[PDB]
Paper text:
To further investigate this hypothesis, we removed the helix and crystallized the resulting [name]ΔML,Δα3 construct alone and in complex with FtsZCTD.
Here we investigate the physiological function of [name] [name], the only cell division-associated protein from Actinobacteria known to interact with the conserved C-terminal tail of [name]. Our structural data revealed the [name]-binding pocket, defining the [name] homodimer as the functional unit, and suggesting a reversible β-sheet-mediated oligomerization interface possibly regulated via an alpha helical switch.
Residue numbers in the entry:
A (entry chain P): 433 to 442
B (entry chain Q): 434 to 441
C (entry chain B): 70 to 136
D (entry chain A): 67 to 136
The structure:
Amino acid sequence: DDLDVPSFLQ
Amino acid sequence: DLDVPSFL
Amino acid sequence: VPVELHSFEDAQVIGGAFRDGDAVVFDMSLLSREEARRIVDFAAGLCFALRGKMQKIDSVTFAVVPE
Amino acid sequence: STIVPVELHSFEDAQVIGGAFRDGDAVVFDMSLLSREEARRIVDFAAGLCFALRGKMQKIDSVTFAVVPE
Ligand SMILES: [Mg+2]
């Protein structure tokens, strides 16, 4: 639950 | 073994 | 679309609805940490390819939005 | 167009695969510098790219794959 949207998808 | 996922 | 994920094979449900032009909200509470990482990477791939939006709702909930 | 080759160093390097692929180019990527789990991540991301655009994905060897546009 420490996961997020990869930064380069911004 | 790293393969193509079945649903492809 | 509120997909409850049981394994990585359920990526196909997210993929199928998303490429059909529908927003998908998926739950990863049943998945292991390794499986959730796989789902997020697959979903990131789906989004990148179609220039869609991906957002984390809460710790085990993400959304993939078309166009 | 001709196949774009990629030597991957990290998961952020998937952006090269994604960028060239969504532009309609076939991409051949090498994962020999990637760890076991990083390669797993790349393959899942590439599978996502492929599925969204109805492209073809193929294993060349254990560290080499290709993503081909529809
Ligand atoms: Mg590296």
